Amino acid sequence: SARHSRLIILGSGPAGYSAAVYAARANLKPTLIAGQLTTTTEVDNWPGDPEGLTGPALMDRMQAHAERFGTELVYDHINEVDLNVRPFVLKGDMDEYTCDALIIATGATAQYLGLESEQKFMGQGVSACATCDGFFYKNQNVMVVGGGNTAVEEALYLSNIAEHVTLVHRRDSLRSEKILQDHLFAKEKEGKISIVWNHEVEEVLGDNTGVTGVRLKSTKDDSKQEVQVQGLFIAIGHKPNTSIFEGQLNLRDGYIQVQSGTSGNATATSVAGVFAAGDVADSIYRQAITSAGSGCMAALDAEKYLDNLLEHHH
Amino acid sequence: SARHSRLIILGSGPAGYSAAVYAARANLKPTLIAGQLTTTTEVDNWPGDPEGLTGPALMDRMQAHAERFGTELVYDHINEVDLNVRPFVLKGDMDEYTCDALIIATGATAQYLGLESEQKFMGQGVSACATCDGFFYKNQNVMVVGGGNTAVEEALYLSNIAEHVTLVHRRDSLRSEKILQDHLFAKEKEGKISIVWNHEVEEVLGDNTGVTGVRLKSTKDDSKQEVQVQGLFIAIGHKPNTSIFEGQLNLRDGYIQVQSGTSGNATATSVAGVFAAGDVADSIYRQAITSAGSGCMAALDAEKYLDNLLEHHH
């Protein structure tokens, strides 16, 4: 038989653990099913942790916090949901779960090159987050790989920090928005950004310093080109972790659509009783602190929903 | 002559210090003018700090964090602003400041009884925040003082934690919204909440345990009444710290109106270049973590605004 909980939070992470702490201190006894921050080596922008913080260390603290006030943690992978009936059904490998309210905090997944040189130097000068790691390379030279909105915005961000940015793309045109393109070409004219078209990364180069260069290979002939850089930012793209909700929730480009606004219920989805927090619904800011904030919001939204539902039953 | 900065953040606090950390790590060199969390004795819902945290300790850490990456802190009180001209003008007791973008993070102020017994037991069982301190009183008896939306919502929140809630008000009707009133009267019928009309707090009672009772005095005759409670929550009201912006920004009930939404620029006000973060713009959630999140959002909003402004000058 299915394990029923009043509230289930799906996903461990800043948003999920934040919702757990608030739901548990509201006396809701939430269940969290655990199954972008845990890959960052040095975390320097979690407000109130000025030095020494690492991604895994922050997750351990958030996990301990959720458990301290009585969250039930469950280690399972959910391969299917039914949001058409209430209580909502979550089908896992180990058990089936049902709940009266659901908070979805499944995050998003950054895509990488898939190169051993890239994995070798992951954390030693290879990064997927300009906002997290850009300040390291003030007055130094960096490279951004990719061709969509994300790559363009990261090169723009970094162009106020780095001495020079090299943006590399495998096609010869960008799939990004026209305002972002205009800003980029302005910076290129002033010498702050260079763009290398029709190329892909062949090998990440460095030593005990970490990254020192990148060898590119052209996608239209056999030629190669070495660029000296201290930081490599992989910005191929982000994918919200929403495949199991397709056809059951309103999505926009794979992100879960939430009500937002300034009059409460800001994390509500298109299904009553289902709330979404963090990077699964946020395409713009995508930081641990903003995710933690929305998880707190989802907890209060869910609390008010469950209380009103409670008022009319039995 | 006026001290010019590209970006000024007005207000120390979770929102202001969070915006400072992000603006400084973006290489913006922000100025923060410093002049609800710093009154909470034990802070138990800052995600990732499971035990031992105090309000002042968290502010010291956030302050150190903003300063580490190069925020210029200024200790001054702003008595007037001019947002009708650019760069915007801030008139202080010690200096005049101007800026190209402004982040307003001035918070809100909770109103108290003004009683020595209330101040005596402040932090030892007297609180202004049910969300912060309610869990302390699980399966115990509490009192909420006030008559508007805030008092009603706090009594509702606490009614799922405490064994019993006593809501006390000086008039004989509530000035709160009708849906909230219906929920309250439902809980009263079931014996979870009691309402004492036409009364005000005369003295807060307790010892080394902290609070043990409250003596009420009627506002319509000379009679008095003792209630045994372990926690007293003062919910007379919140006032956003916005008086100097009246007539210069769109306000709704004194809160600064922000764009919100899921497509970025969520902290933008009715004046281009002016952003608002934290409790000065949030009437619903009002927590340190949600304020910190919006301060991070305001930093990115301001970063994109300043960069575009930069592109077209000189």
Chain B, nearest residue to A60 by Cα: B48
Measured between beta carbons, the chain B residues lying within 8 angstroms of A46 are: 48
Is there a contact between B135 and A25 if contact means CB atoms under 8 Å apart? yes
Resolution of the experimental model, in Å, one decimal: 1.9
CA atoms within 13 A on the CB side of A84: 5
Enter the tokens of residue B295.
């301060």
The angle that helices B288-311 and A178-189 make with each other, rounded to 10 degrees, is 60
Work out the burial of residue A186: count CB atoms within 10 Å of its CB; fewer than 13 is exposed, 13-18 middle, 19 or more buried.
middle
For residue B149, give the nearest of B252, B235, B240 by alpha carbon. B235
Query: Which distant-in-sequence residues (6+ apart) come within 8 Å of A42 by Cβ?
Result: A53, A54, A133
Cβ–Cβ < 8 Å for B133, B122: no
Is there a contact between A161 and B27 if contact means CB atoms under 8 Å apart? yes
Q: Measured between alpha carbons, how far is A224 from A242 in angstroms, rounded to an integer?
A: 38
Tally Cβ neighbours within 10 Å of residue A114. Answer: 8
DSSP A206: E
Measured between beta carbons, the chain A residues lying within 8 angstroms of B62 are: 47-48
For residue B213, give the nearest of B135, B121, B139 by alpha carbon. B121
Q: Among residues B100, B133, B282, B301, which one is catalytic?
A: B133
For residue B304, give the nearest of A259, A156, A65 by alpha carbon. A156
Cβ–Cβ < 8 Å for A273, A310: no
Measured between beta carbons, the chain B residues lying within 8 angstroms of A157 are: 26, 303
Please confirm, yes or no, whether B133 is among the known catalytic residues. Answer: yes
Tally Cβ neighbours within 10 Å of residue B249. Answer: 18
In chain A, how long is the greatest CA-to-CA distance? 74
Q: Measured between alpha carbons, how far is A28 from B143 in angstroms, rounded to an integer?
A: 21
Nearest to B284 among A50, A264, A293 (CB): A264
Q: Measured between alpha carbons, how far is B158 from B154 in angstroms, rounded to an integer?
A: 6
Q: Measured between alpha carbons, how far is A123 from A134 in angstroms, rounded to an integer?
A: 13
Nearest to A258 among B50, B262, B264 (CB): B262
Q: Measured between alpha carbons, how far is B310 from B6 in angstroms, rounded to an integer?
A: 10
Backbone angles phi, psi at A222, to 5 degrees: -100, 5
For residue A255, give the nearest of A269, A268, A242 by alpha carbon. A242
Enter the tokens of residue B302.
């301001």
Cβ–Cβ < 8 Å for B105, B113: no
Rg for chain A, CA atoms, rounded: 22
Backbone angles phi, psi at B240, to 5 degrees: -55, 140
H or E stretch at B32? strand B31-33
DSSP A122: B
Pairing mode of beta strands A141-145, A231-234: parallel
For residue B22, give the nearest of B294, B289, B290, B300 by alpha carbon. B300
Chain B, nearest residue to A295 by Cα: B290
Cβ–Cβ < 8 Å for B155, B195: no
DSSP, collapsed to helix, strand or coil, labels residue A175 as coil
Cβ–Cβ < 8 Å for A275, A102: yes
Query: Which distant-in-sequence residues (6+ apart) come within 8 Å of B252 by Cβ?
Result: none
For residue B235, give the nearest of B159, B171, B153, B175 by alpha carbon. B153
CB contacts < 8 Å between A and B, how many?
A: 163
Q: Measured between alpha carbons, how far is A262 from B260 in angstroms, rounded to an integer?
A: 7
Strand-pairing partners, residue A214, are A204, A227
What is B102-171 written as a DSSP string?
EEE---EEEE----HHHHHHBTTTEES-HHHHGGGGTTSEEEEE--SHHHHHHHHHHTTTSSEEEEE-SS
For residue B104, give the nearest of B84, B87, B81 by alpha carbon. B81
Q: Measured between alpha carbons, how far is B58 from B17 in angstroms, rounded to an integer?
A: 11
Nearest to A290 among B50, B282, B297 (CB): B297
Backbone angles phi, psi at A224, to 5 degrees: -135, 165
Please confirm, yes or no, whether B99 is among the known catalytic residues. Answer: no
Query: Which distant-in-sequence residues (6+ apart) come within 8 Å of A293 by Cβ?
Result: A18, B289, B290, B291, B292, B293, B294
For residue B125, give the nearest of B202, B226, B209, B51 by alpha carbon. B209
DSSP, collapsed to helix, strand or coil, labels residue A193 as strand
Measured between beta carbons, the chain B residues lying within 8 angstroms of A161 are: 26-27
Chain A, nearest residue to B55 by Cα: A48
* Preceding-residue numbers of gaps in chain A (C–N over 2.5 Å): 35
Preferred mutation among A25, A154, A251 to probe B, highest tally of B CBs within 10 A: A25
Query: Which distant-in-sequence residues (6+ apart) come within 8 Å of A125 by Cβ?
Result: A206, A210, A211, A230, A231, A232
Nearest to A69 among B49, B135, B294 (CB): B135
Tally Cβ neighbours within 10 Å of residue A87. Answer: 18
Work out the burial of residue A141: count CB atoms within 10 Å of its CB; fewer than 13 is exposed, 13-18 middle, 19 or more buried.
middle
For residue B270, give the nearest of B278, B281, B279, B262 by alpha carbon. B281
- What CA–CA distances, in Å, run from A94 to A1, A30, A75, A80, B240? 12, 19, 9, 13, 49
H or E stretch at B65? helix B55-68
Preferred mutation among B65, B250, B251 to probe A, highest tally of A CBs within 10 A: B65
DSSP, collapsed to helix, strand or coil, labels residue A308 as helix
Q: Measured between alpha carbons, how far is B313 from B302 in angstroms, rounded to an integer?
A: 17
Task: Measure A115 CA to nearest chain B CA, in Å.
Answer: 29
Enter the tokens of residue B136.
């302390």
The alpha carbon of B92 is separated from its chain's Cα centroid by a whole number of angstroms, namely 23
DSSP A213: E
DSSP A257: P
Q: Among residues A99, A100, A133, A301, which one is catalytic?
A: A133
The angle that helices B288-311 and B14-25 make with each other, rounded to 10 degrees, is 40
Task: Residue B209: give its domain's CATH number.
Answer: 3.50.50.60
What is B178-190 written as a DSSP string?
HHHHHHHHHHHHT
Q: Measured between alpha carbons, how far is A43 from A61 in angstroms, rounded to an integer?
A: 14
What is B264-306 written as a DSSP string?
S-TTB-SSTTEEE-GGGT-SS---HHHHHHHHHHHHHHHHHHH
Is there a contact between B47 and A283 if contact means CB atoms under 8 Å apart? no
Strand-pairing partners, residue A211, are A206
Measured between beta carbons, the chain A residues lying within 8 angstroms of B240 are: none
Q: Domain span at residue A136?
A: 110-237
Give one word for A11, left, alpha or beta, with left for phi > 0 and alpha for psi -120 to 50: left
Backbone angles phi, psi at B202, to 5 degrees: -100, -35
Measured between beta carbons, the chain A residues lying within 8 angstroms of B14 are: 47
Cβ–Cβ < 8 Å for B72, B31: yes
Nearest to A293 among B17, B44, B292 (CB): B292
Judge if the upstream peptide bond of residue A14 is cis by omega within 30 degrees of 0: no
- What CA–CA distances, in Å, run from B107 to A27, B90, B254, B288? 28, 17, 12, 10
Q: Nearest 10 degrees: CA dihedral of B244, B248, B252, B256?
A: -70
DSSP, collapsed to helix, strand or coil, labels residue B191 as coil
Query: Which distant-in-sequence residues (6+ apart) come within 8 Å of B102 by Cβ?
Result: B7, B8, B10, B83, B88, B90, B273, B274, B275
State which amino acid sits at residue B203: E
Please confirm, yes or no, whether B60 is among the known catalytic residues. Answer: no
Pairing mode of beta strands B193-196, A251-252: unpaired
DSSP, collapsed to helix, strand or coil, labels residue B244 as helix
H or E stretch at B99? strand B96-104
